[PDB]
Amino acid sequence: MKEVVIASAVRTAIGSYGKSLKDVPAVDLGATAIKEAVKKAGIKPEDVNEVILGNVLQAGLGQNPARQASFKAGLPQEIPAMTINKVCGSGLRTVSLAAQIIKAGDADVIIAGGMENMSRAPYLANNARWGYRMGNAKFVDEMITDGLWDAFYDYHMGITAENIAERWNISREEQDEFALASQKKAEEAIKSGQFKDEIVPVVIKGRKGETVVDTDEHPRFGSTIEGLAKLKPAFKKDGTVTAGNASGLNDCAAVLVIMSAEKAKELGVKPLAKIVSYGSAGVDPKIMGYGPFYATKAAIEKAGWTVDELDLIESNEAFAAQSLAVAKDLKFDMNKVNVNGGAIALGHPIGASGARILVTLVHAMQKRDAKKGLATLCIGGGQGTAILLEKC
Amino acid sequence: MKEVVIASAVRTAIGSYGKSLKDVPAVDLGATAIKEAVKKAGIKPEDVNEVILGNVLQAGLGQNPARQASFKAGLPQEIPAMTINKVCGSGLRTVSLAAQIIKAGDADVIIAGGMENMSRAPYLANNARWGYRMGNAKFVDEMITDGLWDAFYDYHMGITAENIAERWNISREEQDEFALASQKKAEEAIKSGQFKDEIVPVVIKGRKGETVVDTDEHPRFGSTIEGLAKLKPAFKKDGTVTAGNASGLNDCAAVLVIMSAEKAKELGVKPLAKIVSYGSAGVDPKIMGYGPFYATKAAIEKAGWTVDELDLIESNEAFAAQSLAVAKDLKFDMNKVNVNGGAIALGHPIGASGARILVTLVHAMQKRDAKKGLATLCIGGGQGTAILLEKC
Amino acid sequence: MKEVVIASAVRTAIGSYGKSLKDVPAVDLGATAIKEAVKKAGIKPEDVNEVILGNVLQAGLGQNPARQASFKAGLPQEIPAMTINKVCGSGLRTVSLAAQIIKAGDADVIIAGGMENMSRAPYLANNARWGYRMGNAKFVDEMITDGLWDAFYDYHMGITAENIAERWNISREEQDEFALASQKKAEEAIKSGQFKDEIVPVVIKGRKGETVVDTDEHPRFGSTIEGLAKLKPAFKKDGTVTAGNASGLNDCAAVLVIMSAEKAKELGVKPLAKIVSYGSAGVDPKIMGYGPFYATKAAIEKAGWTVDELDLIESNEAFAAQSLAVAKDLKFDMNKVNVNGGAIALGHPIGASGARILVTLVHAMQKRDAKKGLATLCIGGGQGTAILLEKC
Amino acid sequence: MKEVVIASAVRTAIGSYGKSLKDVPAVDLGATAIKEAVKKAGIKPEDVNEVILGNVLQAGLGQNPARQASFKAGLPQEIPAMTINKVCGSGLRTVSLAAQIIKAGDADVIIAGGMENMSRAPYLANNARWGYRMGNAKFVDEMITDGLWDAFYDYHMGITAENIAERWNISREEQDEFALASQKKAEEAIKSGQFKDEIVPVVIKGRKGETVVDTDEHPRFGSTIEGLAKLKPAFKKDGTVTAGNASGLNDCAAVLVIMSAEKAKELGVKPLAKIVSYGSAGVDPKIMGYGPFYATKAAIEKAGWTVDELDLIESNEAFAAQSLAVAKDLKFDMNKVNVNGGAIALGHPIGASGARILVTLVHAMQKRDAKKGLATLCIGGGQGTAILLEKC
């Protein structure tokens, strides 16, 4: 089939829950990013054949958020758009989906990625329409229900991390060390300017003030192992998982311009990387965190690669426990994993995370002259997704 | 480029607003349709590569409704699933998306379709999380907001219909005649058993009983022109659009098994039709209903067909005004359109409609010397999608 | 010490939950009752010194519901109004409060009574103002919370009834016989016209019609012991209390004009009865239903009367269990109690009940050689109030 | 009739909206105050015959808030309690109501006053019980609807202040000067310890911390006339009323122990003051602010006093405009009005305000050796209430 490339890859900074981006709707984050990704790719809005964006907390956002972001970004109305929901994997899945549409021969240029604003998720009244009749009811946290709660087992994603901790025998201490290393790498990457190429600033203008947001705010600078060790278990009594060793609730948008190699050549675009392969897989939801094992395996096999051939690795850090389990089984060289930091420090804006880690991977591969790169993440409901890139 | 075929095409009865399916979650309707579609295809669940389902009012449904439908159908958990939101076109787009993935070489068997339960849509409190602070606020109807309201023009889909009516000068009388023809064809189709093959009964587990739902309930048997003429305009004072000539709010699921011709020959599947081509298009959101014009023209062009050559046509009746305009412009033979009734009579469960009309198309084609078929529909946000089918 | 009399006593029909009065706000019911009570007293609105009305579910009713009732009745705005909340006893306490103010020398004419519309009670979001932050929360049923739940013991009023049943060993069978006697007396009373004098018809303004409500609708005509024996316990597994032997949720307004005997002689008013004495008492909230025992004993003591001397008794039937216990302890002649049915049959609109039973008492007294009457009721929170009447 | 006295008068500090007392329910404020008022009066809880407390935003507070405060304060369950709602006048009305019950001969010692927590008022869904059916609805601010919105004219209390400003021709400049003087007197009274006798501290203990609240937080220290003059109109375009010249949204509880003079003598209590007279009056709701004119007039006439005989005056400052109108018509000596400051600086916790200003008056009369004192306030819905005290 046609060769498929990434022409540009941009993301907004990742905001903290109810913090810096609390006033900026996901679709506005998405438009900011699309607009910058088009410019960076050096193509006209007119060259785009489709918009495919991830978004998980769609409640009250209005019809087709992806279509909304496309408009607000200045893209012509002629361009079709859809919104994808593969939970945590939505942002990454849109990129492989774009590669597939291109391969099928139906498009040359597709805007892919994801967007999410966890801070602005509504609460819900499920029986308002026909009435509650009598008795107290649940006022629902839509962010937990739609993005973080297992539909089948009736418990938080955090409990699937505990399940992995027990089954793979991953201690609280191990988990804390992993979390601390994530913090340290993020602080260094941030203070040394490693995300400057990737981040597109967000301008929020109020009745009087204008405020620019361009720095990832989730990371806790000067984190310590004693700091992590004092934390209480977040999800269960005597649990190993904490706020410290698990990723947070976050707001972000990350977008990539995807093109066929021939069309890039035509338009004078220098590609950042080729998409070599990808895959998705399902697992028992109670161990959803291990989804990347099978997705990474499938993708690597198709590629003809070996894990040891990989130069850089982005494995999303939803929970220390699942990332450790996955990293051990796949036999990762930890030195090549999440070099600029991971979700424990940077955050987890669900619909956009899979796109976020691929945007981070591509730019790191550029700056480090790394040739082969993997991006993979686990997905609530027991799924996994992955992509392999080879630098141009 | 592999040929893509439809192995089976199933749907539940279409429930009316707050009625027969009001207690059946969308994911359960999807699960019922999925189970029956796999059986009708005569395949093994473990040959299914992916589940791709349409669903628009995802609010409070939990993580990955497509995934829930898959799991509650008893499909193996190894199979990945994703939810698609393209509003009205979602159920049809999953089918074209499935063809694209097979054409890309990444799968041989995919479950596509859509599901929707409008009766169960919640209400939202958008500022519940960080507070309303002071002052009255909106208790939001999520069904309207995410399904039926334009995000850009801030008005109901009905006004997009009034816009086409005004622009094309389509009279109330014309609209009413079209609605009557839809109601007549639907009543005849239901009474003579035309939907018997396509519909999968839904069993509802009562407190100390069981009830079966297997009949479309939206149609108003015995509709008359005089009774339609008496209706007051629905969306605008002195408008032409009414409850009578516009589709309703409905609950349904429609699923199809999609396969490569090659895998179908290997499993000895007897395909219902070949997917010859497809298309999506974006238009001014203000005239969203005219989306099928460009989407249909694109697909037909790819096919090398003409409107003349079509034997059966399914054009969704979101509104009589937009259906009339599309039909006049595309020059359809009305005798070939919506032969068993359309959405004015049958209903419009948004996530599932694009799939529902494909189901209805393929089954109508099996009962006639109908070689060529077209399925097309308009999409809130200013889009259109279409598929062309050829009987096997 | 001036003598205090009742000049008139009126009430609306008692509506059942979500039925006939569901569209009539409590303040409108109050306004209807106020208007008729003033006319029946034959006084001029400008001789009224104060409005004092019972109302418990005030949530969202707007400022000063008593004031709204007064204004919508067409009473002069110069008249002050206040709303009283003593739960179940509110409507009766306004009457005693009125006697106290007249006895103090501060007024000659006061409108007293109560109003309630349980069908219209809202639901609440208690943390909407400053935010829920995260997590599912309760969507609160205000009717239950403000009207039927104990603030101290955290359980339903029904459990206070089970507590009395267990403590006094009042059997389900006893409770059921009492409920049947209430239903029988109510059916006979309604059919033979006993409530014709007391009830003021409520006119409801439909979309293109008018409907009149003038008949109590809670009673179940044709009630049988077998049908009551078959009911499942309402509040406790294996409990004695059921929907059958406990009162319902209802809508009503009951108003009385109260005057000094001296002002009545000056305006030539022919009084229905003299208020001889009254009492309120507090008890353990866990046995709230026994409040009438102490309240009745106190009032009787002040009067210099005995239970023997009473000719007619109105003891509110919030629950058969508590009515039985109060009656046994006070040694009532059951033939003299609730002669036209009680609240098991007629209903329990909380704000208005204490007033309703006074209305019913005075009108029953006018039809018999009933010289001495007692009105008493139990109050959630562990209280009782009582009034003693003597015919004029 | 019997002579009636105030034995003790305590209040919590007044908290600012969503500030210092946001975590302390009204009933808890009320209990803190009752407990201190009993101690200060030098009587046992056992000597109290009834609890009568004002509270306006009762929504979701559970049955009989007054009964709840009485319990939480340690008062025996035998003591009856009720909650009064006369809007702004509720707190003051309970005191005169107590005087009347005592005069009627039914009690010797009554706990009177009011309580309110505006910060904790819920939001409401009025059609949750039977359903909204379809369409956006209002998520209601219960604090505005129940305490600050005119039921009849459909506008904020602020608009009734504007109405007074226009009719009496009170300028924005006049209003600002009045507001500035209120701020200045409050700051001086606070910094000089004038409220030390009256305030009972509130201890809030969290999971870890304990925080004491004992200082009125509403006042803006160092206020200036330029500060006031820059403020925008709060309620209408080109309006005279601002946030600066109108009182705020506040939390407080104020309680008084009321006794007959004979019972005080019996128990060895030294009274703070005698209640000489009181009255309530109704006005056109559109000019509710002028209610104190007629209530003050009635009370003074009964007393046999003259305005010039008054030594101290507490006229509640809901709006500068209404207080100026009232003060002009009643010909007040401004030097004797709100000496320690008024509601513009101190706040307006509705159910408790009328009690708050009487607690302030009594203590000031003590410290200043003032002999005659007036307390009066306007009431939403067009009412007014007043009391006259003579020092013991």
Author numbering:
A (entry chain A), B (entry chain B), C (entry chain B), D (entry chain A): 1 to 392
Study text:
We reveal that CaTHL, unlike other type II biosynthetic thiolases from aerobic bacteria, is regulated via modulation of a redox-switch, indicating that n-butanol production and the relevant metabolic fluxes in Clostridium are tightly regulated by thiolase. CaTHL consists of three domains: an N-terminal α/β domain (N-domain, residues 1–119 and 249–269), a loop domain (L-domain, residues 120–248), and a C-terminal α/β domain (C-domain, residues 270–392).
On the basis of the finding that the instability of RDR confers the redox-switch regulatory mechanism to CaTHL, a CaTHL mutant CaTHLV77Q/N153Y/A286K was generated by introducing residues that might be able to form hydrogen bonds with their neighbours and subsequently increase the stability of the CaTHL RDR. Unlike the wild-type CaTHL, the activity of the H2O2-treated CaTHLV77Q/N153Y/A286K mutant could not be recovered by the addition of a reducing agent as similarly found for EcTHL and ZrTHL. As expected, a disulfide bond formation was not observed between the catalytic cysteine residues in the CaTHLV77Q/N153Y/A286K mutant and the RDR was found to be tightly ordered, forming a sheet–turn–helix conformation even without the addition of a reducing agent. More interestingly, the mutated residues, V77Q, N153Y and A286K, were positioned to form hydrogen bonds with each other. These hydrogen bonds seem to contribute to the well-ordered conformation of the RDR in the CaTHLV77Q/N153Y/A286K mutant.
